[PDB]
Design a protein around this ligand. Structure first.
Ligand code: HEM
Ligand SMILES: O=N[O-]
Length: 153
């Protein structure tokens, strides 16, 4: 779990994301796709994107970044009390989309990276630590649902 102070840091940082959710969502997916091109292959609707210029130009990629960070932000605002929201998300990621838990680690690290890139000097050690714990909790809770299903990849 996260402490009260840690949750407040998380949601303080998330204010930055909410001021430009589509821009943050776009940069997160680009970082994921460029750092880990295997991840692009899980998206039939993005595997036409050969270059980062094509990614940056894709309005549908920004639209999906919005969908992703909206879902994450709603879960974050539950401050760990997210079983109802997280369970069907997890089951969809496993059974529908076949997303290995490693890709969830990749995108967690990508969120941290984009935060530093967009807010250099304004995402301090306490903020990063809090966000990291929140993303770990998210990832670990999804991992429990994956184990229930026997899902690996
Ligand atoms: C913060 C982590 C994530 C969140 C909150 C998230 C959320 C969502 C949501 C809300 C949808 C649409 C609803 C659904 O189909 O269940 C979706 C679709 C999808 N997600 Fe994710 N996702 C995450 C991470 C990932 C990762 C790491 C991958 C692959 C590497 C992935 C691949 C997909 C794909 C392929 C779809 C279907 C897209 C389409 O054709 O419309 N997601 N995600
Ligand atoms: O919640 N104060 O660590």
């Amino acid at each position: 779990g996260l402490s009260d102070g840690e949750w407040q840091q998380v949601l303080n940082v998330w204010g930055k994301v909410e001021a430009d959710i589509a821009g943050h969502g776009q940069e997160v997916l680009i970082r994921l796709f460029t750092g880990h091109p295997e991840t692009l292959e899980k998206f039939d609707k993005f595997k036409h994107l050969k270059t980062e210029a094509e990614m940056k130009a894709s309005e549908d990629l920004k639209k999906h970044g919005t969908v992703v960070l909206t879902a994450l932000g709603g879960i974050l605002k539950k401050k760990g009390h997210h079983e109802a929201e997280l369970k069907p998300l997890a089951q969809s990621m496993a059974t529908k989309h076949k997303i290995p838990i490693k890709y969830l680690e990749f995108i967690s690290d990508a969120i941290i990276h984009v935060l530093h890139s967009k807010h250099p000097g304004d995402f301090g050690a306490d903020a990063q630590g809090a966000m990291t714990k929140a993303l770990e909790l998210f990832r670990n809770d999804i991992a429990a649902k994956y184990k229930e299903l026997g899902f690996q990849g």
